[PDB]
């Protein structure tokens, strides 16, 4: 769990205020507030670390969507190019084999 610069900065300001309040009045100011602060401070780092994983997963899976769409479109087009060349070859060479058949029949 690597701490960011922003969480370290605001924790430094919290450290400043806590040192000021320790020096100003007594020790008994901090003794119950800092465990109620440090868990929130850990939660900030945890939610930022999870959020950055969400961002990188979003980018990779998004670009995989735009890969898939155009690849499927290209593949459909080249299936079509297989599906009329079949027809043209079929009726052309069927007409030629039919003329061959009738010329060999007579």
């Amino acid at each position: 769990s690597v701490m960011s610069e922003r969480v370290s900065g605001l924790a430094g300001s919290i450290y400043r205020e806590f040192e000021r309040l320790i020096h100003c009045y007594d020790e008994e100011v901090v003794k119950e507030l800092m465990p109620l602060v440090v868990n929130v401070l850990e939660n900030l780092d945890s939610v930022l670390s999870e959020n950055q994983e969400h961002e990188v997963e979003l980018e990779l899976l998004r670009e995989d969507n735009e890969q898939l769409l155009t690849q499927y479109e290209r593949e459909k087009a080249l299936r079509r190019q297989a599906e009329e060349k079949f027809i043209e070859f079929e009726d052309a060479l069927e007409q030629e084999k039919k003329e061959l058949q009738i010329q060999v029949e007579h």
Partner: peptide
Amino acid sequence: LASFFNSLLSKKT
């Protein structure tokens, strides 16, 4: 992260 202010506290004990 917990170490920082724990040290903050143990200064005078």
